[PDB]
From a paper:
In this article, we studied five members of the PLL lectin family from P. laumondii subsp. laumondii TT01 (PLL, PLL2, PLL3, PLL4, PLL5, collectively referred to as PLLs). All studied lectins belong to the seven-bladed β-propeller structural family. Each blade makes a W-motif composed of four antiparallel beta-strands (β1-β4) connected by β-turns and loops. The saccharide binding sites are located between the adjacent blades and are uniquely organized in two separate circles around the monomer.
Residue numbers in the entry:
A (entry chain A), B (entry chain B): 31 to 351, 355 to 369
The structure:
């Protein structure tokens, strides 16, 4: 299945900032000039680098953005703001030999932690040694045999939990045994037969919920039946016909809403109705002609905004206001 | 002027939980049984103790609630959940000699920090030594000379910043010089002539904004004019005739909204219109007959919910749905 090709972050002064791989293999970025849904943008600025994955951005607990990418030497590289929303550090290597997009999250103690597929197809991770600070830990293996980019979320008890496509096409997960801990659970399978990266989110009632493209090209989901613990519900189809990984976000009223690339290469969405954890809507098309997975953020106004690579390789955007019309932010962007 | 008499926390499984002082001077709590605006409440459970302030509750970054109170001995006492949303430790003293409600915030490294007025009218503080865990640091003075209760917020660069009524009845502030620092700036005056505790919130564009009852009994506000920095706007009146401390929250679409006890002992509110930093609305009454400052929280549905001590000395609640009818949560509660 197709993968996400940008990340979006919310700056601490409330503006969205988008990171992509340019046609020159540099990381480029583009941001809203003002904190509002209909805001004009800066246009495209290079952060240089020579990269071969999607960039994954996270906001440090001191509000500096940090971007993680696979370099063309297959090491993990990072670049950070020197102060919130201000200038950038330049590229520093964190070593390793990686084969995926990095996935990033923040621990309860403010330390960033990065998960990758290694060249041995295990899940590997490493972390800041102190809140929002260098230096970083050594690389550590969590074993396994995976084929997806990993996805990571924090549980409602502070424990990170990672979801991957296994070599058997099942969904697998592994979690921290306590908040911030270097001791993880064994690998456990959630079964299923999947054909995308998984997407995970935390419901408002504190349960993780995971979304995948099944072998039948439908969207399927599975969720913790209690906060921060198994058992899981087991697999439920939301139907459709999709060709990307799904992406999921929480609306302002905490209904989940999922975005995919359809078989017709349009953007489609489906949502919980009425309230959080409510019964799901029909599938609805937002049109377009897209060649990536969609990426979704919530803006300062509380409205969802979606970013996609268009058939022309520009970055395009559409927002809750009916949704807005499609709007191009130009650029020449690539998939990895 | 009248103060807040409950504190409210958003638990990690999406339920509101209210703490108050009972007529027996113990701390009591009550919670939504499910994570919905529509939810029935548990009713009051005692946490015992013998207290002479409002309790202040905070959620540790590992999702365990923790409550801070002034004991009858004038010491700072705390009580914590042993697991998220599960059982309570019972009371432990952190010593000191305090004269105010405590105010608690979390640092960027996950360490709770508590701010009090000392017996010497100076601002004092102490902090967890590691993320979300005992032991605590020594008591330390940040000096100054203050009246009533402090208020604390985090800046959009992760620096804590505290606001107090000084003994000259101006608003004063003091901030960490760096995220998680123990080095604070000097005291600075923002002038004014106030007769309540201040309330502080962070706007969606990253600027702190403070609300106070002025000596004229109007609601006044002042804001950082840039993210995380002076100079401030200087004081502007939002008029009205109020007899409590104000409380403020952000709506789903990030319009700030302020709640007060009016001179007619009704609950009144006023909000930013159209968007975050659109012009303020007219004052509007939500009726009721109340004898405290209101306390506001956002529920899992993205809806504001307000708690007040009624004339019957029960706790009452009213919520965004046109607001709901008033609903009694019963109990027998007191101010200190
Ligand atoms: C630190 O170890 C190096 O990088 C890891 C991310 C793995 O790819 C491993 O095979 C390799 O030897
Ligand atoms: C449990 O069902 C299995 O896993 C799901 C994720 C889907 O791929 C379905 O077609 C497959 O048979
Ligand atoms: C505006 O610049 C265009 O888009 C960027 C994202 C890069 O692909 C660059 O090479 C290209 O010319
Ligand atoms: C606009 O109304 C004024 O302010 C409100 C907050 C109330 O105190 C009311 O009695 C007073 O007249
Ligand atoms: Cl299987
Ligand atoms: Cl003592
Ligand atoms: Mg299986
Ligand atoms: Mg003593």
């Amino acid at each position: 299945g197709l993968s996400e090709i940008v990340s979006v972050a919310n700056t601490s002064d409330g503006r969205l900032e988008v990171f992509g791989v340019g046609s020159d293999h540099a990381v480029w970025h583009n941001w809203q000039l003002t904190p509002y849904s209909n805001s004009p943008w800066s246009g495209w600025l290079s952060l240089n680098g020579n990269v071969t994955s999607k960039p994954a951005v996270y906001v440090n607990t001191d509000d500096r953005l940090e971007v993680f990418v696979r370099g063309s030497d297959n090491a993990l590289w990072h670049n950070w703001q020197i102060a919130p929303n201000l200038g950038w550090s330049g590229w520093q290597s964190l070593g390793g030999s990686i084969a995926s997009n990095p996935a990033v999250y923040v621990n309860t103690d403010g330390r960033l932690e990065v998960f990758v597929r290694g060249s041995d197809n295990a899940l590997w991770h490493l972390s800041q040694t102190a809140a929002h600070s260098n230096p970083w830990s050594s690389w550590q293996s969590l074993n396994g045999n995976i084929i997806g980019n990993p996805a990571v979320h924090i549980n409602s008890d502070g424990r990170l939990e990672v979801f991957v496509r296994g070599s058997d096409n099942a969904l697998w997960h592994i979690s921290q045994t306590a908040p911030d801990s270097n001791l993880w659970s064994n690998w456990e399978s959630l079964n299923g037969s999947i054909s995308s990266d998984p997407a995970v989110i935390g419901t408002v009632d504190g349960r993780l919920e995971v979304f995948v493209r099944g072998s039948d090209n439908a969207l399927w989901h599975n969720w913790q039946t209690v906060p921060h613990s198994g058992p899981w519900s087991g697999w439920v189809s939301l139907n459709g016909n999709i060709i990307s990984a799904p992406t999921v976000a929480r609306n302002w009223d905490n209904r989940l809403e999922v975005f995919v690339c359809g078989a017709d290469n349009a953007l489609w969405h489906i949502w919980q109705t009425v309230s959080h954890s409510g019964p799901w809507s029909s599938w609805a098309s937002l049109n377009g002609n897209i060649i990536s997975a969609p990426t979704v953020a919530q803006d300062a106004d509380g409205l969802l905004e979606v970013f996609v690579l268009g058939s022309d390789h520009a970055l395009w955007n559409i927002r809750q206001t009916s949704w807005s019309p499609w709007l191009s932010l130009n650029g020449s962007l690539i998939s990895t």
